[PDB]
Symmetry: C4
Subunit: 199 residues, 4 copies
């Protein structure tokens, strides 16, 4: 049924006047148009408000239902205690990225990581371009090491991701330490496909 | 009179489209329906906004009036200095739970506790299932010990609870230290109905 | 002109249904009615939003204009550098209190102080009841000492006050240290009208 | 197109009643009128909300487009790595100031700095009045030194500025340390046009 469509139309209308007030380039206006399309597919809800009204058991049932493909396609999540998984899902924040974008720049102090729900990113360490898709993640190396982004990451398609901050990362992993090593293992393989490591 | 009914109808309508957009299972949609029913009984107010407009003396008169049964049915509150009580009420946050739910999982790092206003929960330490109802609380052991949930707690009925975080717990108890021992006593009896203690 | 009257009528209407939903006593409902009357005199504005849109130079011109009587009637403010004054005004938060109320309870850990704009409070240390009115303040002793409220303070009339937290208090006084001693002097006179002091 | 004009008209209407309720002087009411004129030029958008809906890559494309003249006219920004620049833009907060105003007072503990986008400020250290315009900044000395404003800064025209807090300043400069010295160099020249320095 249509009604949260109008808040979208109503909001995006506001965006349109915002763009026009700032006399933005056309490529920008287009890009902004298409992003909204991809991020909201036409409706808009107070998801934050809706969620807040609910209880934890429900919110978890929702995020869990919504990330069934995320969870099944990702070994680290799929072969994990669904309680650790839940607690991690519950902290991801959804984000959309368009082709060309820079999700992560090299040299930058990294304070978050990403779970590719859907799309293809390009990783360029520079050495060779390694590629990652649905069921993968990246940017965990700054969360472990608290240093600089050991490469660049660039979206090739309309990515749909989930972000996790170092805060939440370290929280979930203090509660479920066994799982720190999973992320550790992966990070090393990658540091050794570069030529580095931490201590 | 009817008018805050509409914000409820208006909000829940939004929930309905939110659920449908996410193509949620029917058991979930039902569960979500019934929760709202139990948490809002049909109206919705900016209680947070209303409260903020008021002063402390009033807000306290309200929460106090509203928790008359909570306070009378609970020795620890009832035989306590109503000033300590007030200051504790004023920090509880209301929460509803449905049958089956997991209020508390074992092994999890605990950062809050609960005051059963109304309903029956099941405690499973696993050893025997101990039961708790109106006029009881639980989950105080992680607040005292800052370790892991020493059992599991599962709602049997539509519970109506009040939650207290460790922050607020420790604040109220620094102002009124005599009362730390009450919660202490209870926690031990329970640790000794298990087989543990802290230091 | 009338339009922010309606938000008041609209809000208070909500309060009315809130009160009725919670089946509050009549004395309470009356008290709540009269408070609103005294705190909003019938209109309601997004003062926080309005203010945020403004700049610092304006907000200060406003609070300054609005506290002309507060500032003139209070030696400590009136004989002070209007720059220190401004910076203090800018941090007060307006509060209304009704007759009978307990602004401050003895024994309680104190985290804020008050500037009587208008009304009469009663101070009971217990020894004798000392009285304070417009152009006075109180509750500065816990801000200096970080201990317990050295008395009780009870409104006799519909008080209109401004509150200052210890945070802001200590901030404004680190920028303008000369002024710490003013509040210090006053606090001692009062501790010696009791029988105490700090160190 | 007109629609965010109404929120402006609707908001400013509220301001008008706010001013009248507080019986503000006419010079103030005028001043407040003209400020709004200069800060919103007639429309109002949820820029914060709009921005939040967007992604980082877009927000940056916007702020970057909007600060083209800011960036080109300011050596420190223009001859800098546009990545450091971006990350700094992204943290500025827009502010408008009217003639006469005190942007910065001497002796005050300084917790932020300014980038003159457009307008002329007057600096009075007191020694001689030095002047600064578009493509300049000031108030960086307290950010480096964490002491007191080494002068006074007063707007001569309707200034349009961008503010940067010490927090964000020190964050951006920990990520891009080479750039600390730029701001350092400038600060010294200025301390030596006074007669001071830090250690
Ligand atoms: N060889 C690789 N294969 C896959 N992913 C990589 C490789 N090298 C780096 N990454 C990811 O790219 C990210 C770049 O930023 P981070 O250092 O935060 O974390 C890095 C890894 O998560
Ligand atoms: N034998 C028991 N009887 C009643 N309550 C208990 C018992 N054992 C544990 N609990 C409660 O169950 C809670 C489980 O989580 P906590 O460790 O936070 O705190 C525990 C107690 O509050
Ligand atoms: N003799 C007195 N005369 C006036 N005010 C007092 C006197 N004694 C205490 N007070 C005020 O009453 C306040 C009670 O709380 P505080 O200790 O925070 O600070 C105290 C003083 O500000
Ligand atoms: N001689 C000068 N020329 C230009 N700007 C100055 C001069 N002296 C001081 N300033 C600026 O004026 C500011 C006053 O506050 P700050 O100490 O924060 O930082 C100071 C400088 O940024």
């Amino acid at each position: 049924s249509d009604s949260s469509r109008r808040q979208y139309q109503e909001k995006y209308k506001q965006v349109e006047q915002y763009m026009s007030f700032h006399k933005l380039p056309p490529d920008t206006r287009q890009r902004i148009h298409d992003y909204y399309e991809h991020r909201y597919q036409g409706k808009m809800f107070d998801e934050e408000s809706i969620l807040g009204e609910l209880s934890e058991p429900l919110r978890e049932e929702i995020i869990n239902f919504n990330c069934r493909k995320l969870v099944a396609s990702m070994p680290l999540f799929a072969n994990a205690d669904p309680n650790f998984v839940t607690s991690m899902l519950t902290k991801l924040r959804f984000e959309v990225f368009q082709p060309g974008d820079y999700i992560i720049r090299e040299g930058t102090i990294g304070k978050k990581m990403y779970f590719i729900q859907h799309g293809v990113v390009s990783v360029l360490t520079g050495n060779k371009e390694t590629k990652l898709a649905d069921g993968s993640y990246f940017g965990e190396i700054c969360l472990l090491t608290r240093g600089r982004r050991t490469a660049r990451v660039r979206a090739d398609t309309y990515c749909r991701l989930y972000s996790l901050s170092v805060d939440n990362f370290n929280e979930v992993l203090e509660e479920y330490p066994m799982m720190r090593r999973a992320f550790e293992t992966v990070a090393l393989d990658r540091l050794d496909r570069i030529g580095k490591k931490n201590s």
